[PDB]
Structure formats: structure tokens, C-alpha cells
């Protein structure tokens with residue numbers, strides 16, 4: 249019973265590694281110029297903020313018996329950090345440079361603030377509930393982009409901006425982590441990951457629809 | 462007792478008043494029905510509304526919150542009506558983009574709702590369940606208020622009450638008042654707060670209607 | 677006894693005095709409005725949002741909601757009064773009937789709504805859950821206000837000009853945020869510390885930006 253839970257966690261984590269390779273396309277495009285035209289820099293920053301707070305949830309002081317999420321969000325957050333660090337010097341125009349760096353300062357300092365406030369002001373079991381609520385809120389907030397790109401596919405009647413390799417992996421990742429939180433009976437892990445399972449399932453199905461015809 | 466009877470009277474009153482609100486888009490859907498076009502109309506609000514009605518309906522049901530059944534009844538009959546609407550629309554939709562958009566959002570709302578209901582009964586044992594489904598529900602209902610506030614804005618800017626009918630505004634004012642009374646009697650915050658907030662909005666709406674209708 | 681109290685009251689008073697500059701900040705606009713007698717160039721909503729914030733926080737400050745929260749009621753009270761004065765001047769000096777009606781309607785919504793949530797807070801909730809509720813609502817408000825100065829920082833970074841964003845205002849705001857942060861810190865009240873800690877961060881970033 250335990251073994252299956254742990255295996256599920258490892259599987260979900262390793263699956264997340266695949267989703268993390270998705271933004272490499274714009275990063276290929278940076279050598280010429282890094283804006284990117286038609287695209288906006290902040291989401292990567294946003295994603296890292298999320299991964300930070302979730303990593304906070306993962307740590308043993310906040311919630312006991314919840315080790316693996318700290319692992320996936322940790323390696324994920326670090327890899328994101330690499331992205332923003334790469335962006336800011338290669339940023340186009342000083343204005344963009346300063347904006348992204350500033351927002352980064354905001355994220356790091358703020359996360360330090362909520363980490364500190366969380367560990368100081370809150371005693372168990374409240375601490376877990378709070379950091380949990382914030383984590384679930386972040387994960388749910390993130391889902392906006394896949395829903396939007398789904399909208400774009402419907403509008404264009406074409407998968408012109410939606411890759412399958414990324415999508416299938418994310419579907420598997422949500423299913424796995426949903427199983428993780430469900431088996432662990434921790435709601436904060438289960439719910440958003442289940443919602444992600446739904447959004448991904450819709451993604452795969454609609455992809456079948458527009459790839460077919 | 463007098464409290465049981467009053468509670469039922471308030472709940473039912475809210476139900477009957479609300480019925481007008483649910484039947485309000487029947488004119489637009491009749492016009493949609495004519496010439497079988499959804500080109501001119503959208504279309505999405507029925508999804509946002511169905512999601513809301515389901516989550517409040519879940520709250521009403523006896524497993525999550527007991528003795529608040531009339532809420533389940535209004536939200537249920539309401540959800541069926543909205544579902545009929547999105548179905549009529551979804552087949553009568555003009556262009557594949559609109560039809561498939563509505564289909565997708567429908568799958569999204571229904572599966573999502575299933576997820577939150579199931580999680581609610583699974584992960585949560587009483588009374589926290591009631592508190593959770595309550596907060597989610599209250600959040601939804603308060604979120605709905607965006608549209609009438611918006612049309613109040615349109616009325617003020619256009620100095621016209623074209624998009625604000627008194628019959629509807631008054632009826633919804635009454636349902637809000639009634640359910641506000643309902644929660645108030647039940648001493649249920651989750652019922653009282655959003656409908657009370659709605660009572661304020663309906664009151665302002667009726668007032669602005671008075672101000673701008675007179676001339 | 678411990679050095680809890682001595683720092684505790686002084687932090688609140690000092691923070692309040694530092695805070696005073698922010699409430700007087702838009703008076704320049706009203707000076708420019710008073711000569712103008714228009715309000716065309718300016719809208720209009722921010723004074724209402726700010727009044728809403730100030731009432732929710734003031735309610736939190738009251739002994740009805742929270743015991744031992746004395747200074748907060750004071751600063752938020754002075755704030756609410758000033759904001760109400762602003763809204764009255766804007767609404768009377770309003771440019772166009774549309775603006776006048778927009779503002780009057782929203783003022784009605786805010787005052788009526790706040791009274792509503794006050795009543796519900798004191799009615800439905802018994803301690804300590806009440807303080808937790810009014811705290812959560814207050815915190816959401818205060819954090820919500822923070823969007824606008826961040827917006828002016830965005831405008832400054834994007835537009836090379838450091839127009840708007842006063843150093844006096846920025847320093848005063850950093851100081852008030854920091855002080856009330858210490859107040860929440862000593863009280864071990866999360867709802868007080870967290871938004872003000874965030875304010876200390878935003879003030880720090882702004883201070884950094886004056887060093888263009």
C-alpha cells in the first residue's frame with residue numbers, strides 16, 4: 249500500500265520533468281532576440297512563484313509525511329529559476345530587463361515573507377491547512393493558460409499552438425498526483441491535480457478531434 | 462412551531478420569485494429559436510450559471526447541509542432549466558467554433574462539479590463539509606453579481622433603462638430579500654450573506670430604475 | 677514585566693504619524709481640481725476602494741471585533757473620514773451627471789455593503805471565529821489595495837519618466853508599513869503583519885527605484 253503511493257509519487261515527478269522541457273522552444277529563439285514577439289515574459293516568473301509556495305508545502309515542518317511534492321516542486325522551481333536568470337540579461341530593452349528583475353525580487357522576497365509568517369504565526373495543524381490553501385490556490389490559478397490555449401485551438405479549428413508531447417505528459421502527471429493526494433487523503437494535493445486531470449483529458453480529446461479533422 | 466413555518470414560507474417565497482429570474486431569458490431564447498441563429502447571441506452565461514446552480518444545489522442537499530432543502534429545490538429546478546438552455550443553444554449554435562466551445566465548457570463544468578462534490582463528501586466529514594461547500598457556493602453566488610452590477614453601469618452611462626426591466630429587477634430583489642430572510646432565520650451565514658448582498662444590489666437597481674425611468 | 681508593551685503602543689502611534697502623509701497625498705489633485713472645479717481629468721473610483729478598505733479595517737480595530745487592537749481603529753478611522761471627505765468633494769464637484777451618478781451609486785453600495793458585513797460579522801460569528809473572519813476580509817482588502825502602487829511602478833519602469841510616485845510619499849508609506857508590520861509582529865497577529873510586511877517589501881522596492 250505504501251509502496252504504491254511512493255511509486256506513484258516518483259512517476260508523477262518524473263512525468264513533471266517532461267512538462268518542464270516545454271518552454272525550450274522560445275529559448276531556442278532567444279539568440280536572435282528575446283522578447284519574444286507575440287509572447288510575454290512574466291508567466292515563467294509566475295510559475296516559479298507557484299512552485300516556490302508548493303515547495304514550501306512539501307517541506308517536512310509544514311506537513312508531515314508529505315515528502316515527494318517538495319521534490320518535484322523543488323527541482324521544478326530550480327529549473328524555472330534558471331529560465332528567469334537567463335531571460336533578464338538577454339532581455340530586450342532595459343525596461344523589460346528591469347521589470348522582470350523587479351518582479352523576480354517581488355516573488356523571492358514575498359515567498360520568504362509567507363514562508364516566515366507561515367512557520368512563525370501558525371502552529372499545527374493550522375499551518376498545514378494555510379500553506380495548503382495557498383498552494384491549492386496557486387495551482388488552480390495556473391490552469392488559466394491551458395484553458396486559454398484550448399480556446400485558441402477551438403477558434404482556429406487547428407492545433408497550430410498546441411503540442412501533444414507536452415499535453416499527454418501533463419495528463420499523466422495530473423492522474424498520478426491526483427492518485428497521490430487521494431491515496432494520501434490530502435485534499436490540497438488531490439483537488440487541483442484532479443482539475444488538471446480534467447483539463448488535460450479535455451485537451452487530449454479535443455486534440456483527437458482537431459488532429460482528425 | 463412558528464419558526465418552521467416561517468422558514469418554509471421564506472424559502473418557498475424565494476423559490477417562486479426566483480422562478481421569474483430563471484424564466485427571464487426565455488424571450489432571448491425564443492428569439493434565438495426564431496431563424497435558428499445563435500450568431501447574434503452568446504451563450505456563455507448559461508455555463509457560468511449552471512456551474513453556480515449546481516454547486517449551490519449540492520449545498521442544499523441533505524448530506525452536506527441539512528434542513529436547507531428549499532435552496533436545493535430552487536437551485537435544482539434552476540439548474541435543469543439552464544441545462545435545457547445550453548442544450549438548445551449547443552445544437553442550434555451557428556458555426557463549429559461556437560458549438561464546440563459550448564460543448565467543451567459543458568464537459569468542463571460538469572466534470573469539475575463532480576470533482577468538487579465528490580471531494581466534498583469524501584475528504585470532509587461534518588461539519589467542515591458544510592463549511593467548505595458553503596464557502597465555495599457563497600463565492601459562486603457572490604461572483605454572479607458581476608452581471609447586474611455591470612448592467613447598472615450600462616444604465617447609468619446610457620441614461621437608459623433599456624437593459625433593466627422593472628419586473629425582473631423587482632422579482633430578483635424579492636428573491637434576494639426572501640432568501641436573505643431564509644438564511645437569517647436559519648442563522649446560516651452562507652445563505653444570508655450573498656443573498657443579502659444581492660438584496661442591496663437589487664435595491665440600488667430598483668432605485669436607479671426609478672431615477673432614470675421618470676424621464 | 678517584559679519590554680512588550682513599551683514597543684507595542686509606540687509602534688502603532690509612530691506608524692500612524694508616518695501614515696498621515698498618504699491620506700493627504702491626493703490633496704494636490706483636489707487643489708488642481710478646486711481651481712479647475714471639474715474632475716474631468718480624474719476618475720474617481722480609487723477613493724471609494726480606499727474608503728471600503730478603511731472601513732473594513734476600522735471595524736477590525738473596534739473592541740467589538742478585536743480586543744487589544746487599539747491603534748488600528750484610530751489610523752483606519754482617520755483614513756475613512758478623510759476618504760469620505762474626498763468622495764464628497766469629488767461627487768459634488770463631479771464633471772458630468774454620469775460621473776456624479778456613478779460615484780453616488782458606488783458610495784451607496786460601499787456604505788450599505790460594509791454595514792451589511794459588519795452586521796453579519798457581529799451576528800453570525802462568536803469569538804474567536806469572528807476576529808478570524810473580519811481579519812481574513814481585512815487582509816484581502818489591504819492586499820487588494822497594493823495593486824495600484826505596483827501599477828505606478830510599472831508605469832515608471834516602462835516610461836523612463838519618474839513622474840508621479842513621490843519620494844516623500846514612498847518613504848512615508850514604507851515607514852508606516854514597516855511600523856504596522858512590527859505591531860502585528862509583536863501582537864503575533866498574522867492578519868496585521870502579513871499585508872504590512874508585503875507593504876514593507878513594496879516600499880523597499882519603490883525606495884530602490886527612486887535611486888533610478
Ligand SMILES: CCCCCCCCCO[C@@H]1O[C@H](CO)[C@@H](O)[C@H](O)[C@H]1O
Pocket residue numbers: 588591592596597599600648649650651800809
Ligand atoms: C469564503 C469563506 C468566508 C468565510 C466562510 C466561513 C463562515 C463560517 C461558517 O459560519 C457558521 O459557523 C458554524 C460553526 O461555528 C457552522 O457550523 C455554520 O454552518 C455556519 O453558519
